[PDB]
Design a protein around this ligand. Structure first.
Ligand SMILES: Nc1nc2c(ncn2[C@@H]2O[C@H](COP(=O)(O)OP(=O)(O)OP(=O)(O)O)[C@@H](O)[C@H]2O)c(=O)[nH]1
Ligand SMILES: Nc1nc2c(ncn2[C@@H]2O[C@H](COP(=O)(O)OP(=O)(O)OP(=O)(O)O)[C@@H](O)[C@H]2O)c(=O)[nH]1
Ligand SMILES: Nc1nc2c(ncn2[C@@H]2O[C@H](COP(=O)(O)OP(=O)(O)O)[C@@H](O)[C@H]2O)c(=O)[nH]1
Ligand SMILES: Nc1nc2c(ncn2[C@@H]2O[C@H](COP(=O)(O)OP(=O)(O)O)[C@@H](O)[C@H]2O)c(=O)[nH]1
Ligand SMILES: [Mg+2]
Ligand SMILES: [Mg+2]
Lengths: 42, 49, 433, 58, 430, 432, 430
């Protein structure tokens, strides 16, 4: 799998071009609620 | 270049099978022993003529 | 019953409007074909019911070179628009202000204003107009100026909002942009209630730093602009604790009739990687909204005082946290306001969370801030464009092609003196009593 | 005659299998944390840690 | 809508036109029979730019072929893609030119031009919305150098507002294929300088050098050279026929390129150009595209831009790449070669992007430049002119057909002028 | 409500930070991904992501990306925020000029931006930690620049300098006296308190107590991390006698100039198989003041003591503490200066030290970490002064410093600064 | 990141590079076709230091081959690993230099160097952040000894800040292949002393002694010597490409090895060197490695390092080990050989470590020592030069190509000044 710019080993090996970055760590799947919720006063 | 890399990668992805069962006298004697131990009972079952 | 008419003229205007309408249709739920998916009545700001089923956007597309018009008509949005309002010319003005303002634009502004009148007749509670064009293009500048001067006498007191992209100091595509820019600013200095600063290198640095994109194209820039516009205009179509309409923009951002040029900012702008690790609280997000690198224009606010700042919070922001954050900004010393303005902050709140296009680069965030600031430091762009104009006009380069179109020699001189008047007005306002 | 350079010093002894060659010492010491069940017996802990150190050395 | 007609005259111009039409037909996927067998729908959206529709679904070029001899016509007719042209557009005389500018432009040209003017005005009336004209010719011959400028003037008086470009082959002393270049060359350029809107100059010596060193061809040929120049000229109208991020048509190029009315001579170039072997080890990136296109090696003329300062430069990139990377590459190169650029015009580089790369290549750039370098060619040709004119050699032929030395004197005076006020801006400081 | 940020600069700083942070995540139970599997003390060193993991309050600065991408590819990639691992371009290569005037200014501004947008998040800043090895170019230069900037950016906020000073005779550098003296001149008046952490003393400790003939830098960093954890456990754990960071520099610093202390830790016990013992409080505190047990190669018996503060963790009893202190002050081998009738500060914490699995130390129910200000510290300054004088006698290596934006006078200023410091140390210890 | 570009010239440098690229490609898992076939991920993060990316994923060296005889080029291209090089990087003359330093430095070298300057500037601009240049050559030749030194002079002119290092195969008198060696060696060293930031000398006599003694191989060859030098030259850049406890790049080595700006000549060695029929036993622990280090007869130079006092030393260990044995052994060497080390620079040894051992070894080391011993080689070279120059033998060709005795007399005066000022530091006391 680890040939040149297809798969993930590290950022140097990913070596992205064009539009964006390939995701690295795990990331939440699609539509996670990022950051704190708020407005609890009970 | 791309096809050669595909071939090399798909071949490198396959290796880790050892499963040692060298078997000449070990398996010959195993067959003999299992045959004896199994067919003793089948000898002591037969309906007499 | 609130509605606004949007005009996209020029290549930059059309390309920005494409992303703008993608964002609006996705935000309101309408499919590209226009049909309602399998009422709330919140689309009246930007769409009009056809009577049964689909909806029609309140936009007019105009340009003299039909490439982008053909692209739109062959794209996935063939069914959305009104096949008659997408007016396309025959030959492009070729970055010549006189060609667009005197030669070919004259027989197109007639049908353009006819379409505007037709839309306004259907409109009932019309709030105003949005105009989208680039200043570094001759046709864009000339036809924008002609259309605005026509509207100023056809309608009069109705508000106009100008989203014009001024050239950057170092990075630019043409060779004659400054001539067009100075002529267009001469034309629009006294015709629009507001103007926004949207130079390209600022958003380039923005996307290289925060989004950390390496070679983004115009699509990302237009998407960011669309995000800004949607954040600005969500208050007219969504319920909020602090409802704000367009009338409370020039009310609070125009201290004197001449001073009406602002610069914008938006936050947060974070990919999925870095927002997974960071707080996204109101205080920090508004602190980042004011830092020297997130403005939409290349200006140094530490080189001038502030006049008026208005920001809209969109999401679930709490007014108490807003007030605490504003107090912290006041106690901050690196930011200073003009003496005759004790309070200059206009905060707005909306409950509707930000929306993200699928396949985009932005991450879904439950708080957002759109900031519009008028400050004394904006004079630097006028100074640099004036200096560049003097550099070319020293030996009258490229003048004769404008002259041969019918153009007279003196408008360069009077635009120069008008820009001098504008800069001296800014300097006189910026002084302490 | 053999053409060109045709070196044969062979500085590497070769034919050894150092499968633990590219293992970074920093990572392999700072993040191994293998086995070590929560047993309170000093002898058991000592045997396990001695074996762990032997593996780290080899 | 948005179309340009093509007229070719003389041997060299006819060969340029034939190879250009073959290249365009291959680019748009049209077989020699005139039927369409392309794949992309976008390949046919603006077929009307260069072609006209005929009964049965066939496409025909809007080209006109003219000369005083039929050898070129019936040579190119039997060649590949030779049946595209409508036969009624072939106009040819029978007297010949003798490489005599006066004889071509005065004795037979006046009587022959009626048919070609009629057919070109017919095409201009028939076309939807004409923007300009394009003419391919050589300055070193008689027939081309005469009737080229003749048709230029004749088109001009009734089209003062439309634009017009001439791909003119200039003569050079290293490669001289005739003995009467200075006379006819200066006579033609005398009227080109005052009537032409754009003129792109091409040098055979530069073509030979580029195909020898960069291309590393063992046996370069006229067909190969014609293909090179045809590709270079086809690259100009990329965004005019295909969509692009930053559209820039011919009039946009004109307005961005012309600082003064009489300075409309350009040098062009194409990239990437790789040899047979090095292309295997090569990669494709915008930095090396920019480096190759800004190499004075890649220029199509013997003039060396390192000996002068650029007035205006332009680059038509084609393929899918982002605008900024290109644009700050232009910024960096302008900063690095600031002394080689005119100082009182900031940001004198034009960038345009088209989204349809050439067939077989991922991306390609066409460079156009107007710089003080071309004064060397004018000085050289003027020196040859005055050397040949001091002894009045070869002059009696011209003078025997109603010619006289006075307009020769004004032609040389105008050339000396052009040189003087073209060098004047080189040392001008703000 | 109490937060502290640590700054790591230099290769040694990064390596010691790796060890300290793995120690903290082990101690708090945060599995290296950050997510807690299956309180509120973590707020001292970590910040909640909101739902799930935690983020350390540290920034890593280094001009050579080798250590940075080693961290980013190691098993601890999951932990840190991707944009706080700030990597420069050129390592200073043991050149102070490069790290302080040449290329450090293009990174110090971004570092200060990181500092501000980290500190604004927190509210209860007691102070900051800084880790650096003075025997290097980039670490020393960037640390000095950062301290000089922060002294005016924040002012009264506390700073803790855990510098790595050169060892008395072993060395991996040859030009390290120059950068050491320059950084000492910079740091004399820009930090609140600093510690001595020379490598030779720790080498002696690990060979003597651990009975290991194969120690490397990993063991060094683990011991230093244990020291840091013992120092900082009082901020996040209940103890019978709590102590704050602000309770340190108001007690161990008699005069503003003298703020360089030296540490010790006990009992450092190997895990071979033995029962060892129960490690009585009296005997462990006796071992703590053993002169050869000191974490720095400074002999206390050659000088006088100004102050001593020790912290016990485990189930230590204050009566045992006081009896042990009575015994130590009864002992004659150590003596105090006359104008300090008492010089002891005591801290107590209930939390026993946490043992790192696969480490060298064994679990123990008592431990003590001691930090002392003593007069005999002047010897290392004197020997480094002779070190630098032997080099500057004939202006060796001076020319590349001069040619990289450095003027020449400042060596004399550093020399006279060290002269003033040694004279102050000599005069403070004199009898009244 | 912080890559270094390779430029080799002359037959000596060409053969040196032919084996350097072999060793580097073997270390990094690259075949003759530029195809990666490694196993670990650590082989690729820093591969950009020596290689550039091409389309399809191939890595190609950033090496520039320059010479005057095409024979070396087509000999080295036909060999293995010759396809890695890009043909555009080959630059060679057609007339040769004939071991004439004057002809190579004044007549033909200046004429030819323009193209190689263009290509080296192209590479230096292409690289993201230039770290330095590294050169390999010999002073026993003419073309190398001239054009190298000229190239160093000019590239230092354009890049006065970036570090640079050169390796010099200096001639030896006992086994000498030219009577012109003193002349061109003196001229080239005079040019190099004020230009090269680092210079590292190699002696074929010492190489022969090593391969005869410690390898116990009966028949050495130039390939074998090139392999030895390539191993040493690969060892120096270990931690620059691979992680370790204490990374120490070329700039670090330069800072720590040179006391005074005019003293930048180095002698080196490698360890361990075991016999070909080495029995399988034990392992190379630190004590024997550091003893074989400081065996003075292990050095790759004919100079006897115990004849003088070491100004400084440097060790690059390769493999996984602790630093305690490192520094204690270095102090032990210091204390046992305190007579060989000058006293006013105490603790004068660089220690650096890399975690990835050489292929087929568990532990290895490269030693680079700056010692007062090289003065004898300079003394003998100067003696031979003045003996040959007193009666002006072979001088007339050197005078026939534009220069005179002034260059020779100033060069020998500078050489004597260098030797004298190098010796006063030997007997200087603290
Ligand atoms: N933000 C943004 N600006 C653009 C985009 N495309 C073009 N521009 C700007 O538009 C300016 C020039 O105008 P054009 O886009 O070419 O179109 P125009 O203003 O109508 O003028 P013409 O080209 O003659 O049609 C350039 O300086 C660009 O900065 C885009 O996609 N996004
Ligand atoms: N305690 C400890 N000190 C170390 C370690 N590694 C290096 N050092 C110290 O670091 C000093 C040399 O500096 P470097 O390790 O190169 O890091 P630096 O201080 O930033 O210097 P640079 O090379 O410029 O990066 C040595 O004198 C050591 O004392 C380590 O792992 N543990
Ligand atoms: N590229 C190219 N150049 C040509 C060709 N034929 C002629 N030429 C050029 O035309 C020049 C001679 O021009 P000439 O034939 O007298 O022009 P004419 O009188 O208009 O036909 C020569 O210098 C050639 O370089 C051709 O097929 N291809
Ligand atoms: N170690 C080594 N020395 C070499 C090699 N090739 C040539 N030499 C030495 O270089 C000297 C001759 O140099 P020369 O070929 O004239 O250099 P050039 O003129 O630049 O090609 C001889 O004394 C050889 O000892 C080689 O491959 N390895
Ligand atoms: Mg346009
Ligand atoms: Mg370092």
């Amino acid at each position: 799998y680890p040939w040149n710019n297809r798969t993930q080993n590290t950022l140097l090996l990913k070596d992205d071009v064009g539009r964006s970055k390939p995701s690295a760590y795990s990331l939440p799947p699609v539509d996670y609620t990022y950051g704190r919720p708020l407005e609890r006063d009970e | 270049i791309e096809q050669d890399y595909m071939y090399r990668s798909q071949q490198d992805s396959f290796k880790p099978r050892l499963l040692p069962k060298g078997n000449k006298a070990s398996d010959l004697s195993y067959t003999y022993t299992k045959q004896k131990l199994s067919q003793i009972q089948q000898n002591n079952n037969k309906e007499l003529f | 019953m609130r509605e606004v008419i949007s005009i996209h003229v020029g290549q930059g205007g059309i390309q920005v409007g494409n992303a703008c309408w993608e964002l609006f249709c996705l935000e309101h739920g309408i499919q590209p074909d226009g049909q309602m998916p399998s009422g709330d009545d919140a689309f009246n700001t930007f769409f009009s019911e056809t009577g049964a089923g689909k909806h029609v956007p309140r936009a007019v597309f105009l340009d003299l070179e039909p490439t982008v018009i053909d692209e739109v008509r062959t794209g996935t949005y063939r069914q959305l628009f009104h096949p008659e309002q997408l007016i396309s010319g025959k030959e492009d003005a070729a970055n010549n202000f006189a060609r667009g303002h005197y030669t070919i634009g004259k027989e197109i502004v007639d049908l353009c204003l006819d379409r505007i009148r037709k839309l306004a007749d259907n409109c009932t509670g019309l709030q105003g107009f949005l105009v989208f064009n680039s200043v570094g293009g001759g046709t864009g500048s000339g036809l924008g100026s002609l259309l605005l001067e026509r509207l100023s006498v056809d309608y009069g007191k109705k508000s106009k909002l100008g989203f014009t992209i001024y050239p950057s100091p170092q990075v630019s595509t043409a060779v004659v942009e400054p001539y067009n820019s100075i002529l267009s600013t001469h034309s629009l200095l006294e015709h629009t209630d507001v103007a926004v600063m949207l130079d390209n290198e600022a958003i380039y640095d923005i996307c290289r730093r925060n989004l950390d994109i390496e070679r983004p194209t115009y699509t990302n820039l237009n998407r960011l602009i669309a995000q800004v516009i949607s954040s600005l205009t969500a208050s007219l179509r969504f319920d909020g604790a602090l409802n704000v309409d367009i009338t409370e923009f020039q009310t609070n951002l125009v201290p004197y009739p001449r001073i009406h040029f602002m610069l914008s900012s938006y936050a947060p702008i974070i990919s999925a990687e870095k927002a997974y690790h960071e707080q996204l609280s109101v205080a920090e997000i508004t602190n980042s909204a004011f830092e020297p690198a997130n403005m939409m224009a290349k200006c140094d606010p530490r080189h001038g005082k502030y006049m008026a700042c208005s920001m809209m919070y969109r999401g679930d922001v709490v007014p108490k946290d807003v007030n605490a954050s504003i107090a912290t900004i006041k106690t901050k010393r690196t930011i200073q306001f003009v003496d005759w303005c004790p309070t200059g902050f206009k905060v707005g709140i909306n409950y509707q969370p930000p929306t993200v296009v699928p396949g985009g680069d932005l991450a879904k965030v439950m708080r957002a801030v759109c900031m519009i600031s008028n400050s004394t430091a904006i004079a630097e762009v006028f100074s640099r464009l004036d200096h560049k104009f003097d550099l070319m006009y020293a030996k009258r380069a490229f003048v004769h092609w404008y002259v041969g179109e019918g153009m007279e020699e003196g408008e360069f001189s009077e635009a120069r003196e008008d820009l001098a008047a504008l800069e001296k007005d800014y300097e006189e306002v910026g002084i302490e009593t | 005659p053999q053409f060109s350079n045709a070196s044969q010093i062979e500085v590497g002894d070769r034919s050894e299998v150092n499968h633990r060659r590219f293992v970074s010492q920093s990572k392999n010491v700072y993040g191994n944390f293998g086995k070590f069940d929560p047993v309170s017996n000093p002898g058991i802990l000592a045997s396990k840690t001695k074996w762990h150190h032997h593996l780290q050395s080899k | 809508m948005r179309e340009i007609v093509h007229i070719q005259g003389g041997q060299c111009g006819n060969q340029i036109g034939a190879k250009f039409w073959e290249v365009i037909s291959d680019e748009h996927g049209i077989d020699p029979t005139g039927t369409y067998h392309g794949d992309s729908d976008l390949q046919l959206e603006r077929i009307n730019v260069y072609y006209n529709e005929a009964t049965g679904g066939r496409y025909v070029p809007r080209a006109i072929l003219m000369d005083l001899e039929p050898g070129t016509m019936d040579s190119v007719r039997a060649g590949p893609f030779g049946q595209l042209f409508r036969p009624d557009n072939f106009v040819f005389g029978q007297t010949g030119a003798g490489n005599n500018w006066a004889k071509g432009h005065y004795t037979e040209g006046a009587e022959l031009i009626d048919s070609v003017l009629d057919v070109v005005r017919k095409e201009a009336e028939g076309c939807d919305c004409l923007q300009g004209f394009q003419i391919t010719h050589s300055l070193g011959g008689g027939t081309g150098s005469g009737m080229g400028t003749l048709l230029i003037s004749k088109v001009r008086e009734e089209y003062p507002d439309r634009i017009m470009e001439t791909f003119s082959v200039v003569p050079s002393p290293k490669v001289s294929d005739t003995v009467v270049e200075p006379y006819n060359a200066t006579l033609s350029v005398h009227q080109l300088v005052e009537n032409a809107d754009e003129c792109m100059v091409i040098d055979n010596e530069a073509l030979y050098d580029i195909c020898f060193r960069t291309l590393k061809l063992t046996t370069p040929t006229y067909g190969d050279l014609n293909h090179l120049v045809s590709a270079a000229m086809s690259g100009v109208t990329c965004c005019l026929r295909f969509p692009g991020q930053l559209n820039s048509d011919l009039r946009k190029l004109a307005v961005n390129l012309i600082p003064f009315p009489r300075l409309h001579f350009f040098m062009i170039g194409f990239a990437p150009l790789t040899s047979r072997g090095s292309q295997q080890y090569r990669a494709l990136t915008v930095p090396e595209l920019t480096q190759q296109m800004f190499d004075a090696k890649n220029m199509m003329c013997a003039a060396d831009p390192r000996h002068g300062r650029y007035l205006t430069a332009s680059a038509l990139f084609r393929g899918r790449m982002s605008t900024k990377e290109v644009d700050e590459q232009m910024l960096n190169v302008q900063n690095k070669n600031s002394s080689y650029f005119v100082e009182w015009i900031p940001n004198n580089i034009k960038s345009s992007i088209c989204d349809i790369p050439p067939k077989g290549l991922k991306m390609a750039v066409t460079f156009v430049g107007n710089s003080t370098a071309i004064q060397e060619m004018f000085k050289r040709v003027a020196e040859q002119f005055t050397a040949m004119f001091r002894r009045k050699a070869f002059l009696h032929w011209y003078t025997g057909e109603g010619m006289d030395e006075m307009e020769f004197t004004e032609a040389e005076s105008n050339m000396n002028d052009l040189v003087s006020e073209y060098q004047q801006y080189q040392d001008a400081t703000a």
